[PDB]
């Protein structure tokens, strides 16, 4: 039906607005508000690319994308960082836990189609 996406974002309108997006590019969707969920969400099921938001609360996105890459398949996931503050808090914390490559809010629906493809297509 079409490739996986865990969608790790916890603003209300940010999860209407990247969900439609994604499903809008043929993506099937997991939508997860918080670290936490995106751990368990990542231990269970092989997603194709997972977008991790930096600031999450619970679990942050720098501790969930750590603990997802210490799983034996989030190992390899394409892991996308959501950055808001690609400027500075974000550089110098989310940014350098492991990620593949960033999308800096706020973000066209073409970055995200060039984004996805480049890593699910890698
Ligand atoms: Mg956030």
Redesign the pocket.
């Known amino acids: 039906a079409g490739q996986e996406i865990l969608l790790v ?3 209300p309108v ?1 999860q209407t607005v990247i969900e439609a997006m994604l499903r809008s590019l043929g993506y099937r969707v997991t939508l997860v508000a918080d670290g936490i969920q995106a751990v368990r969400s990542a231990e269970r099921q092989r997603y194709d690319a997972i977008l991790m ?5 619970v679990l942050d ?1 720098y501790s969930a994308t750590r603990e997802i890459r210490a799983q034996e398949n989030g190992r390899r996931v394409p892991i996308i960082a ?1 950055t ?1 503050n690609a400027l500075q808090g974000d550089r110098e914390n989310c940014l350098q836990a492991g990620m593949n490559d960033y999308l800096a809010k706020p973000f066209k629906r073409a970055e995200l189609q060039r984004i996805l493809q480049r890593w699910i297509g890698s």
């Open positions: 974002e916890d603003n940010n938001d930096c600031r999450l609360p996105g959501l808001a």
